[PDB]
């Protein structure tokens, strides 16, 4: 209540304590104390942490129960931009220990608790017609860029050319950078096949 | 109220606020201290920013649930000029992030 | 004239261009003057020749 406030012969007056301004950059970061009930109505057990946006209030006063941990800047991905985020949160609102995903395209989220980025954000691959990658999987997988979804083994190489945008998935690895090589004819160059020794 | 003023025994003055004259080479840069209502009849809520043109007022006092952040000189552009916009404001009044 | 992800190509001619959002300009080429009976050697790094 706004005003002014006579405390009672058995309360006591300890401090003021003022809203968090929330905007769409900016999140808040809440720990429990205890377990109890916040304003949207949902439960809090003790020691679980969540995050409070700008689409719930615009100002937030920390209650009694819950811990400031920090205010959360929001990481925004341009077109050109992606990054892989270590440990996501889960449809059951856990963080997949030991996991990975790869988030691209031009998107704005906040890291919720427990997450967290790789190597920051990142540059997709933007492949001339003269440029191309030498690529690695770590499992085995089935990449999807086209009606040819070609599997692959878990210790596989193939090329990729062309004139494209490649991300990484989380289970394929980039181990170099070729170059078309420039040929005139009557002119030319000896390669060998290492796997076959020709 | 425009002439001589008695504040009530209750009521005290603190000082003098005059008005912010607008342009057509300026805007002001206005944030909201709380939630209220402004004059053109439009909801602020908390933190929340907007400019104030010179189709708005000539003459605009700055509320008590206002904070001036400062005045926007106009940009202009020639027929042989062009500019590049970070984060434009889309179609419901939101900063489109990283476009 | 649609592009892919990495074309290139060249825009000639009097006009005026601003660049798109998603357009890079990489370089700026000049027309080189020949009289007849007289020339330059081009390579093709596409093909090679």
Same mark, same amino acid.
């Given at each position: 209540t706004v005003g002014a406030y006579l405390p009672a012969?058995?309360?006591?007056?300890?401090?003021?304590?003022d809203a968090v301004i929330l905007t769409e950059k900016t999140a808040l970061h809440l720990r429990?104390?205890?377990?109890?009930?916040?304003?949207?109505?949902?439960?809090?057990?003790?020691?679980?942490?969540?995050?409070?946006?700008?689409?719930?209030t615009e100002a937030h006063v920390p209650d009694v129960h819950e811990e400031v941990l920090g205010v959360v800047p929001i990481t925004t991905? @341009?077109? #050109?931009?992606?990054?892989?985020?270590?440990?996501?949160?889960? %449809?059951?609102? /856990?963080?997949?220990?030991?996991?990975?995903?790869?988030?691209?395209?031009?998107?704005?989220?906040?890291?919720?608790?427990?997450?967290q980025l790789e190597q920051g954000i990142q540059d997709v691959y933007v492949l001339s017609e003269q440029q191309g990658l030498l690529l690695r999987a770590l499992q085995p997988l089935e990449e999807g860029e086209d009606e040819e979804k070609v599997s692959h083994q878990a @210790?596989? #190489?193939?090329?990729?050319?062309?004139?494209?945008?490649?991300? %990484?998935?989380? /289970?394929?690895?980039v181990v170099e950078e070729r170059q078309a090589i420039p040929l005139d004819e009557n002119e030319g160059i000896y390669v060998q096949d290492v796997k076959t020794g020709k």
């Amino acid at each position: 209540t706004v005003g002014a406030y006579l405390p009672a012969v058995f309360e006591e007056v300890l401090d003021l304590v003022d809203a968090v301004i929330l905007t769409e950059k900016t999140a808040l970061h809440l720990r429990a104390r205890r377990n109890f009930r916040d304003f949207r109505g949902v439960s809090r057990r003790t020691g679980e942490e969540w995050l409070v946006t700008v689409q719930d209030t615009e100002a937030h006063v920390p209650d009694v129960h819950e811990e400031v941990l920090g205010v959360v800047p929001i990481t925004t991905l @341009g077109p #050109h931009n992606y990054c892989v985020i270590l440990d996501p949160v889960g %449809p059951d609102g /856990k963080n997949q220990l030991g996991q990975k995903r790869v988030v691209k395209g031009e998107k704005s989220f906040f890291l919720q608790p427990g997450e967290q980025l790789e190597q920051g954000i990142q540059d997709v691959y933007v492949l001339s017609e003269q440029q191309g990658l030498l690529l690695r999987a770590l499992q085995p997988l089935e990449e999807g860029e086209d009606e040819e979804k070609v599997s692959h083994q878990a @210790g596989d #190489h193939w090329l990729i050319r062309g004139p494209l945008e490649y991300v %990484p998935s989380a /289970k394929v690895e980039v181990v170099e950078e070729r170059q078309a090589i420039p040929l005139d004819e009557n002119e030319g160059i000896y390669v060998q096949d290492v796997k076959t020794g020709k």
